[PDB]
């Protein structure tokens, strides 16, 4: 019996209020800035490179993905901003590689395609990291991997950051071998030149497809990717006339995987939230100093804006409860202020509940600056904050993290930061991430100097202090920008707040391809 009437979250914001008008205007500008920058990245290398690419009869990398996935199906692209201003004088749109999750023959798959128009498809250090992140996502969720291979090899000027280390180019083949041993299909389509060391990617794949004239595989047509590779050498499993033919063959290969998705969780009919998503612009804004009720964010992403809060009046700075997104059950943990001992205990209790019932967890990070409280006897927080860091780490249910505000210090770890292997991590265009907030850092620097100056007896003037402080503030702002963080692969993308519900729905759906394991906890330091 599911006919019980229940209460719903959310309230109607005051559209006429000046605060709402200002917050909407600021957030809208950030979203528009995000959109137009992606448009530029969409063009890859440029008109001359794109014209040359098409002149050889090859499809553009994004057109290949469009033809590969099922007609009209959504495509979840990841790390669109990798390599954004990462290198001083070189522009590398998207890192030279396009990765995302789409549906092929009704099966969710991870698609990894080299962008040959960007530096001829050479592998920059960020390119390796982006690919390795994609492989990690595919393995953790048991998603078949499809490699649209068109590459020019490693970027020699930066070889030391590509070749040698464990998380360097060598790890790519290690991941392929491991996934194959686990029956996670590895499919490679050589749609262009495969350079030295990239010839392994077609070979290490379970099934392989090579284009007749364009494809070349060699550790050019005669040496590799030849009819020799297809027939005499036997490296090729399927022979394709052109790019369209190869993509058609790939869809057939996936259809023969003999795989059917099975769900471990209970399912209920989906319902839209009771409030518009675009109202999040006015509610949240771009000023991290102002505070908002995280429940408002929840009310606009969960099915029917229905939410069962757990321990509502205890540790109120943290909000935990049960909801459903697109029918899936989810346990939501979101910050609503500074973390306290009660908040950490409340979170630790909640995480155990979700792990016991095998319920996916969603974290909404919005940590607060220390301008309000200098110390507050933080020693008490240390004893309890660890209990949450330890429960979150050991949890085996799928975990997704969304940074809707600040993310500073140990608060990042307790809320399932990147270091704690959430299945996905997304950030809103207004976020900031740093070891500490910029102002606090300045104060700390100031005290040390003033006191040391005092030992010397030299006077640290008021002007002297300000001069010291300004560079520090600037560095922290520059390095906490959402773009700096996404340029390196610290998150899986910057998403428009109006798209939060859709992105979460796609992400949780993909994460459910793998069975949920039993959670084993360490010692809880009572």
């Amino acid at each position: 019996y599911h006919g019980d009437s229940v209460a719903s979250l959310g309230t109607q914001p005051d559209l006429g209020s000046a605060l709402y008008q200002e917050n909407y205007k600021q957030m809208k500008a950030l979203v528009n800035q995000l959109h137009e920058r992606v448009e530029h990245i969409k063009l890859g290398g440029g008109e001359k490179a794109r014209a040359l690419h098409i002149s050889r009869g090859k499809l553009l990398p994004r057109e290949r993905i469009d033809n590969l996935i099922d007609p009209g199906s959504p495509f979840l692209e990841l790390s669109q901003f990798a390599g954004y201003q990462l290198y001083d004088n070189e522009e590398v749109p998207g890192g030279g590689i396009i990765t995302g999750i789409g549906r092929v023959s009704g099966v969710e798959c991870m698609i990894i395609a080299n962008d040959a128009t960007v530096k001829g498809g050479a592998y920059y250090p960020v390119t390796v990291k982006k690919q390795l992140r994609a492989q990690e996502i595919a393995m953790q969720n048991r998603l078949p991997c499809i490699y649209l291979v068109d590459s020019g090899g490693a970027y020699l000027p930066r070889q030391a950051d590509v070749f040698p280390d464990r998380d360097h180019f060598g790890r790519t083949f290690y991941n392929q071998a491991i996934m194959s041993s686990k029956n996670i299909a590895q499919i490679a389509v050589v749609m262009g030149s495969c350079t030295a060391g990239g010839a392994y990617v077609p070979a290490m794949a379970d099934e392989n497809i090579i284009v007749r004239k364009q494809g070349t595989i060699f550790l050019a047509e005669d040496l590799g990717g030849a009819d020799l590779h297809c027939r005499k050498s036997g490296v090729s499993d399927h022979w394709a006339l052109d790019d369209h033919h190869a993509l058609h063959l790939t869809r057939k290969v996936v259809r023969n995987l003999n795989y059917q998705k099975k769900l471990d969780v209970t399912i209920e009919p989906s319902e839209e939230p009771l409030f518009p998503a675009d109202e999040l612009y006015g509610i949240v804004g771009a000023n991290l100093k102002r505070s908002f009720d995280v429940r408002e964010v929840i009310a606009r992403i969960v099915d029917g804006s229905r939410f069962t809060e757990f321990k509502a009046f205890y540790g109120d700075t943290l909000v935990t409860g049960f909801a459903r997104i697109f029918g899936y059950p989810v346990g939501i943990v979101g910050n609503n202020g500074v973390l306290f001992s009660e908040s950490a205990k409340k979170g630790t209790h909640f995480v155990q509940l979700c792990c016991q019932r095998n319920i996916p967890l969603l974290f909404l990070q919005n940590i607060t600056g220390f301008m309000v409280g200098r110390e507050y006897e933080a020693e008490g927080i240390a004893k309890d904050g660890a209990k949450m860091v330890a429960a979150v780490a050991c949890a085996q249910v799928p975990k997704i993290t969304l940074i809707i505000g600040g993310s500073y210090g140990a608060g990042n770890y307790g809320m399932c930061g990147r270091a704690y292997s959430p299945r996905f991590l997304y950030i809103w265009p207004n976020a900031r991430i740093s070891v500490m907030g910029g102002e606090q850092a300045a104060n700390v620097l100031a005290t040390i100097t003033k006191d040391q100056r005092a030992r010397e007896g030299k006077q640290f003037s008021s002007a002297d202090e300000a001069a010291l402080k300004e560079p520090i503030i600037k560095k922290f702002e520059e390095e906490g920008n959402p773009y700096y963080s996404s340029a390196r692969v610290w998150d899986d993308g910057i998403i428009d707040p109006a798209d939060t519900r859709l992105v979460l729905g796609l992400s949780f759906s993909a994460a459910l391809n793998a069975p949920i394991e039993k959670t084993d906890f360490g010692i809880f330091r009572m």
């Binding site: 006339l241 369209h244 033919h245 058609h248």
Partner: protein
């Protein structure tokens, strides 16, 4: 109610059988009918538009014409024979 329109979806080349049988052994009988006339001997040189056979079907005369300028390898029917629809009438030497 304004009208009817037909639009054709292009067929990918790969799906189209590559190298479909190319040689066609003479026009196939328009329908099942008696062969009333044969204008070609077992080995005869013919040019496109050379009448090969005349067939009457439900009282309607059809004249079969030479598809190619190739010499005739063989004839599958004689006069007075009833030929079924789409059955080969003439065999042409491979060139």
């Amino acid at each position: 109610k304004e009208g009817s329109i037909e639009i054709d979806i292009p067929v990918p080349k790969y799906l189209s059988s590559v190298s479909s049988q190319e040689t066609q052994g003479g026009p196939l009988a328009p329908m099942t009918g008696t062969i009333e006339k044969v204008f070609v001997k077992a080995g005869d040189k013919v040019k496109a538009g050379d009448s090969l056979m005349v067939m009457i079907a439900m009282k309607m005369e059809h004249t079969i014409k030479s598809p190619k300028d190739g010499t005739v390898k063989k004839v599958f029917y004689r006069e007075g024979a009833q030929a079924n629809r789409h059955t080969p009438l003439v065999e042409f030497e491979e060139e």
